[PDB]
């Protein structure tokens, strides 16, 4: 019944939103590493999030904060965009609210080597209210860590894509993330010695188990 082949076909599709997110992150880091000023970066980021598709829903640039600045509005200067049209949000730069430099997705990438990517736990962004997984990476300027870039994946969009693809291939699938959270479970069950095909994504530390659908 070609289960292993169809499971590989499904894994290739599941890899697409994740490879897509990595590519967008590479574009974000190019912008963060550049000599463009704040307004030029805002324009490029707005354009970038306007053209990207798939499961990508928000993200942007998170400069290393200056917590010692006397003006509270100068401490945090993230460039964060949300795909509704594309809106720029300032909500994460609220000094009263702790800023962003202690968030899991910032800390994972902080001062890490360029070219490494980090995947957050599932969470609901407190300002866009979208349930999401974030991929992040550091960027540098003049040899020094300068900030974190992020891309947010819509969990709802990811679920729909994986389930619809598995249905098309007449498969059931469970997809778990690196924290053991069940991202998607679509028509998956085992009985009467049903074969299960397992695949581990080596770059993302995610896991799928696949069965034939009846
Ligand atoms: Cl689900």
Automatic annotation (TrEMBL):
Q: Which GO terms describe its molecular function?
A: hydrolase activity; phosphorelay sensor kinase activity
Q: Keyword annotations for this protein? A: Hydrolase, Kinase, Membrane, Phosphoprotein, Transferase, Transmembrane, Transmembrane helix, Two-component regulatory system
Taxonomic superkingdom: Bacteria
Keyword Zinc set for record = no
The protein's name is: histidine kinase
Q: Which organism is it from?
A: Vibrio cholerae serotype O1 (strain ATCC 39315 / El Tor Inaba N16961)
Shown part of the complete sequence: 46 to 262 of 736
């Amino acid at each position: 019944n070609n289960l292993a082949l169809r499971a590989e076909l499904l894994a290739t599709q599941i890899r697409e939103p994740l490879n897509n997110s990595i590519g967008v992150l590479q574009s974000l880091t190019s912008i963060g590493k550049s000599a463009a000023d704040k307004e030029e970066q805002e324009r490029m980021l707005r354009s970038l999030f306007s053209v990207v598709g798939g499961v990508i829903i928000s993200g942007g640039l998170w400069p290393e904060p200056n917590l010692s600045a006397t003006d509270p509005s100068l401490r945090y200067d993230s460039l964060f965009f949300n795909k509704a049209q594309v809106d720029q949000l300032s909500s994460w730069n609220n000094p009263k609210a702790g800023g962003y430099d202690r968030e899991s997705w910032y800390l994972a990438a902080e001062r890490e080597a360029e070219g490494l990517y980090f995947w957050s736990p599932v969470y609901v962004d407190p300002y866009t209210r979208v349930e999401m997984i974030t991929v992040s990476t550091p960027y540098y300027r003049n040899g020094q860590f300068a900030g974190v870039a992020t891309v947010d994946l819509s969990l709802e969009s990811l679920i729909q894509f994986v389930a619809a693809t598995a249905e098309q291939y007449n498969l059931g699938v469970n997809l778990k993330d690196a924290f053991g959270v069940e991202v998607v479970s679509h028509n998956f069950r085992t009985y009467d010695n049903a074969l299960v095909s397992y695949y581990s994504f080596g770059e993302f530390n995610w896991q799928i188990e696949v069965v034939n659908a009846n």
